[PDB]
Structure formats: structure tokens, C-alpha cells
Design an enzyme around this catalytic site. Structure first.
Site, PDB file in Angstrom:
ATOM      1  N   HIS A  67       1.868  -5.434   2.886  1.00 17.33           N
ATOM      2  CA  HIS A  67       2.596  -6.582   2.227  1.00 17.33           C
ATOM      3  C   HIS A  67       4.128  -6.697   2.845  1.00 17.33           C
ATOM      4  CE1 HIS A  67      -0.585  -6.574  -0.692  1.00 17.33           C
ATOM      5  NE2 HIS A  67      -0.454  -5.496  -0.714  1.00 17.33           N
ATOM      6  N   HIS A  76       2.460  -1.198  -5.035  1.00 15.59           N
ATOM      7  CA  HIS A  76       1.829  -1.907  -5.359  1.00 15.59           C
ATOM      8  C   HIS A  76       1.936  -3.621  -5.541  1.00 15.59           C
ATOM      9  CE1 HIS A  76      -1.949  -3.869  -7.576  1.00 15.59           C
ATOM     10  NE2 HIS A  76      -1.012  -4.300  -8.473  1.00 15.59           N
ATOM     11  N   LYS A 114     -10.284  -8.540   3.835  1.00 19.74           N
ATOM     12  CA  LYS A 114      -9.886  -8.615   2.443  1.00 19.74           C
ATOM     13  C   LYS A 114      -9.521  -9.925   2.047  1.00 19.74           C
ATOM     14  CE  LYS A 114      -5.952  -6.553  -0.247  1.00 19.74           C
ATOM     15  NZ  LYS A 114      -5.011  -7.615  -0.680  1.00 19.74           N
TER      16      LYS A 114
END
Length: 120
Positions: free
Chosen positions: A12, A113, A39
């Protein structure tokens, strides 16, 4: 221990991306090993790492829903969304560049996350 933070960065984080178009997504999704299986959605956050880390403290973050944090500042982001019927490569992606605040989960003051729901 810090393996989640380092996997967050791999999945990310892209400090200074090259032109945030479909071809950027197809390339970086490969480079980061996110293409077996493809993904379905993934978002990269641009800018410096310290701004993202700061979400975990009250400097750039507030608590959010169940044990997430939401940023106070907005981030340059790019969302890669898989197109085509197949879960398997070649993985074609549509890029959506964005500028907004982001939702993370923190562990030991590190982001571990990214909440993808806000970019769907």
C-alpha cells in the site's frame, strides 16, 4: 513483529509513483507480487511514510469504527481495480487516482492494515 508494517508498505505504499494510469497499476501490482491470484482491489498511498505512521497517533488520526483509525490529513492515493472475468494473470487494472483521508489499523504505532472499503 514489524512484518505486518513491512507488508503494509509493500501492499500500500509508493512514495513517488510514475504517472498513475492503468499501466502504472498493472506494473506496480506485479512488482509488489499482488498478481497470483489477481488481487481484486488495492490502493497505494503516496507521499512520505511519516504521514501514514502519524495516523496511529492523535497527530494525524482519530479512532474509527471498531479499532481502526481515520486520518485527519488527505493523501494522494491510487486505487487499482481488477477488470476482466478471470482471477488469474495477466491482471488488467483500471487506475483511479484520488485525494482523501484514509482508514488504517495500527499495531504498536505502525499501520498494519488499509481499509479498502472506502475506495470501492
Amino acid at each position: 513483529d514489524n512484518s505486518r508494517y513491512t507488508h503494509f508498505l509493500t501492499q500500500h505504499y509508493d512514495a513517488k509513483p510514475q504517472g498513475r494510469d492503468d499501466r502504472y497499476c498493472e506494473s506496480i501490482m506485479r512488482r509488489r507480487g499482488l498478481t497470483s491470484p489477481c488481487k481484486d482491489i488495492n490502493t497505494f498511498i503516496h507521499g512520505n511514510k511519516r504521514s501514514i505512521k502519524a495516523i496511529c497517533e492523535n497527530k494525524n488520526g482519530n479512532p474509527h469504527r471498531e479499532n481502526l483509525r481515520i486520518s485527519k490529513s488527505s493523501f494522494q492515493v491510487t486505487t487499482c481495480k481488477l477488470h476482466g472475468g478471470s482471477p488469474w494473470p495477466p491482471c488488467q487494472y483500471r487506475a483511479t487516482a484520488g485525494f482523501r483521508n484514509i482508514v488504517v489499523a495500527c499495531e504498536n504505532g505502525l499501520p498494519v492494515h488499509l481499509d479498502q472499503s472506502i475506495f470501492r
